[PDB]
Design an enzyme around this catalytic site. Structure first.
Site, PDB file in Angstrom:
ATOM      1  CG  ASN A 133      48.762 -17.201   6.341  1.00 21.11           C
ATOM      2  OD1 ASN A 133      48.474 -16.950   5.175  1.00 21.11           O
ATOM      3  ND2 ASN A 133      49.365 -17.367   7.526  1.00 21.11           N
ATOM      4  CG  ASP A 188      51.828 -13.650  13.314  1.00 23.11           C
ATOM      5  OD1 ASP A 188      52.837 -13.861  13.549  1.00 23.11           O
ATOM      6  OD2 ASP A 188      50.894 -14.004  14.201  1.00 23.11           O
ATOM      7  CG  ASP A 245      50.825 -12.499  17.820  1.00 25.99           C
ATOM      8  OD1 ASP A 245      50.224 -13.050  16.796  1.00 25.99           O
ATOM      9  OD2 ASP A 245      52.106 -13.390  17.889  1.00 25.99           O
ATOM     10  CG  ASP A 303      51.344 -12.026   1.827  1.00 23.50           C
ATOM     11  OD1 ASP A 303      52.053 -12.622   3.046  1.00 23.50           O
ATOM     12  OD2 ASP A 303      52.345 -12.463   1.292  1.00 23.50           O
TER      13      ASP A 303
HETATM   14  N1  LIG Z   1      50.298 -14.704   4.153  1.00 23.69           N
HETATM   15  C1  LIG Z   1      52.336 -15.345   5.349  1.00 23.69           C
HETATM   16  N2  LIG Z   1      52.301 -16.086   6.402  1.00 23.69           N
HETATM   17  C2  LIG Z   1      52.576 -15.614   7.839  1.00 23.69           C
HETATM   18  C3  LIG Z   1      53.907 -14.845   7.686  1.00 23.69           C
HETATM   19  N3  LIG Z   1      54.968 -14.868   8.453  1.00 23.69           N
HETATM   20  C4  LIG Z   1      54.892 -16.006   8.794  1.00 23.69           C
HETATM   21  N4  LIG Z   1      53.211 -16.555   8.608  1.00 23.69           N
HETATM   22  C5  LIG Z   1      52.715 -16.931   9.126  1.00 23.69           C
HETATM   23  O1  LIG Z   1      52.390 -17.157  10.083  1.00 23.69           O
HETATM   24  C6  LIG Z   1      51.686 -17.831  11.158  1.00 23.69           C
HETATM   25  C7  LIG Z   1      51.696 -17.765  11.962  1.00 23.69           C
HETATM   26  O2  LIG Z   1      51.140 -19.059  13.444  1.00 23.69           O
HETATM   27  P1  LIG Z   1      51.605 -19.316  14.870  1.00 23.69           P
HETATM   28  O3  LIG Z   1      51.194 -21.165  14.363  1.00 23.69           O
HETATM   29  S1  LIG Z   1      53.359 -18.525  15.302  1.00 23.69           S
HETATM   30  O4  LIG Z   1      50.286 -18.651  15.745  1.00 23.69           O
HETATM   31  P2  LIG Z   1      49.171 -17.927  15.237  1.00 23.69           P
HETATM   32  O5  LIG Z   1      49.297 -16.597  14.684  1.00 23.69           O
HETATM   33  O6  LIG Z   1      48.044 -18.797  14.295  1.00 23.69           O
HETATM   34  O7  LIG Z   1      48.095 -18.360  16.660  1.00 23.69           O
HETATM   35  P3  LIG Z   1      48.857 -16.916  17.734  1.00 23.69           P
HETATM   36  O8  LIG Z   1      47.055 -16.335  18.384  1.00 23.69           O
HETATM   37  O9  LIG Z   1      49.481 -15.685  17.425  1.00 23.69           O
HETATM   38  O10 LIG Z   1      48.110 -18.177  19.480  1.00 23.69           O
HETATM   39  C8  LIG Z   1      52.709 -19.482  10.671  1.00 23.69           C
HETATM   40  O11 LIG Z   1      51.279 -20.052   9.571  1.00 23.69           O
HETATM   41  C9  LIG Z   1      53.400 -18.718   9.597  1.00 23.69           C
HETATM   42  O12 LIG Z   1      53.790 -19.822   8.325  1.00 23.69           O
HETATM   43  C10 LIG Z   1      53.868 -13.848   6.191  1.00 23.69           C
HETATM   44  O13 LIG Z   1      54.854 -13.229   5.811  1.00 23.69           O
HETATM   45  N5  LIG Z   1      53.205 -13.968   5.297  1.00 23.69           N
HETATM   46 CA   LIG Z   2      49.819 -14.466  15.536  1.00 23.06          CA
HETATM   47 CA   LIG Z   3      53.300 -15.060  17.821  1.00 21.88          CA
END
Ligand SMILES: Nc1nc2c(ncn2[C@@H]2O[C@H](CO[P@@](=O)(S)OP(=O)(O)OP(=O)(O)O)[C@@H](O)[C@H]2O)c(=O)[nH]1
Ligand SMILES: [Ca+2]
Ligand SMILES: [Ca+2]
EC number: 2.7.7.65
Length: 164
Positions: free
Chosen positions: A45, A80, A37, A54
């Protein structure tokens, strides 16, 4: 040419696990899973843009393939999130593989448009198949380990064990 379209659809998980559990039980070979993860991907982002996010997904996916064998399996599990099924990897080898993936990604220095190095890391939960016929239990314990890796501060691999 797009590593993201070379990841297996998560629909294949039950298919492949049921096969690999049978093979493992016949031959006595270790079987394990990594759930991976991306760390603070929302911040990535927000800071560098969705397109950069991406591109990062491709870089990490390529790191997976560069560090596992063709007899292992790599799945897109969520936005992710990824699953790797490792065949013939003992607990030590499983941790070694996970640590390699974590390290390779940490040391990947992608340049933003301003020349700044983009900080990137991931967290990994790892677990060994213990014999229960339901592969979903194995995913659950790996996910518990992943949550612990996150809570401890991210950029971490955690192997599931009872003492956790
Ligand atoms: N560029 C891009 N962003 C994505 C995608 N699919 C999901 N996301 C983004 O991945 C982000 C995941 O954020 P989370 O709040 S679930 O968790 P974090 O990764 O910020 O924090 P952790 O380390 O997992 O606690 C979200 O803002 C989603 O919008 C994607 O396909 N492409
Ligand atoms: Ca994450
Ligand atoms: Ca997650």
């Amino acid at each position: 040419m797009d590593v993201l379209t070379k990841l297996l659809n998560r629909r294949f998980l039950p298919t492949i696990f049921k096969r690999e559990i049978a093979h493992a039980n016949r031959t006595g070979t270790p079987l394990s899973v990594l759930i991976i993860d991306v760390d603070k991907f929302k911040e990535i982002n927000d800071t560098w843009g969705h397109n950069t996010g991406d591109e990062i997904l491709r870089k990490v996916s390529q790191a997976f393939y560069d560090n596992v064998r063709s007899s292992d399996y790599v799945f897109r599990y969520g936005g992710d999130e990824f699953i790797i099924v490792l065949t013939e990897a003992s607990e030590n080898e499983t941790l070694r593989t996970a640590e390699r993936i974590r390290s390779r990604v940490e040391k990947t220095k992608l340049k933003a448009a301003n020349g700044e190095d983009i900080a990137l890391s991931l967290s990994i939960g790892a677990a060994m198949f213990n014999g229960h016929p339901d592969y979903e239990r194995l995913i659950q314990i790996a996910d518990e380990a992943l949550y612990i890796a996150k809570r401890r501060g991210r950029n971490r691999v955690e192997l599931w064990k009872a003492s956790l």
